[PDB]
Amino acid sequence: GSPGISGGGGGIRSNDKVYENVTGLVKAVIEMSSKIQPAPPEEYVPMVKEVGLALRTLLATVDESLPVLPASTHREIEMAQKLLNSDLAELINKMKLAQQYVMTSLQQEYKKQMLTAAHALAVDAKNLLDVIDQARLKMISQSRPH
């Protein structure tokens, strides 16, 4: 499902598999966030498996985007897949102490921080993806490095 009815001479345009890995990853963020409500300890790491897999699938679609496009686009994939890379690293840290003391305040606090860093995951998975949607057309729109 690639939309190209409007845009112009460039911009972000593809809505590639990176978005479908983000369909999976982001949906987990908000949805599972409240599924820890009925069942307090998700163990969170289990969902780390769910979103980690989705955002690594994302990273691999971005990584795969690195050698599918010319040398220029390589460095947008460099920046983007690394960015959420460390973002996912904070997601898991807050996610971590939430289940550790899921018995208490951490659970609710840390998991909110979890879906906050996962809404950061969502935000930057939007952004970084937008960066490859950017990357592909911006490197074509570029004159110097291609």
Swiss-Prot record:
Q: What modifications follow translation?
A: Phosphorylated on tyrosine residues upon activation, e.g. upon integrin signaling. Isoform 2 is phosphorylated on serine or threonine residues, but apparently not on tyrosine residues.
Location of Phosphotyrosine modifications: 19
**Protein's cellular compartments:** Cell junction, Focal adhesion; Cell membrane; Cytoplasm, Perinuclear region; Cytoplasm, Cell cortex
Protein origin, superkingdom: Eukaryota
Using the record, list the residue span of the signal peptide; answer none if the entry has no such feature. none
Q: Which residues form a coiled coil?
A: none
Q: What is known of its domains?
A: The C-terminal region is the site of focal adhesion targeting (FAT) sequence which mediates the localization of FAK1 to focal adhesions.
Q: Which family does it belong to?
A: Belongs to the protein kinase superfamily. Tyr protein kinase family. FAK subfamily.
Query: What is its quaternary makeup?
Result: Interacts with ARHGAP26, GRB7, DCC, PIK3R1, PXN and SRC. Interacts with the ARP2/3 complex.
**Could you tell me what this protein does?**
Non-receptor protein-tyrosine kinase that plays an essential role in regulating cell migration, adhesion, spreading, reorganization of the actin cytoskeleton, formation and disassembly of focal adhesions and cell protrusions, cell cycle progression, cell proliferation and apoptosis. Required for early embryonic development, embryonic angiogenesis, normal cardiomyocyte migration and proliferation, and normal heart development. Regulates axon growth and neuronal cell migration, axon branching and synapse formation; required for normal development of the nervous system.
Protein name per its UniProtKB record: Focal adhesion kinase 1
Q: Which organism is it from?
A: Gallus gallus
Q: What taxonomic classification does the UniProt entry list for its organism?
A: Eukaryota, Metazoa, Chordata, Craniata, Vertebrata
Q: Which gene encodes it?
A: PTK2
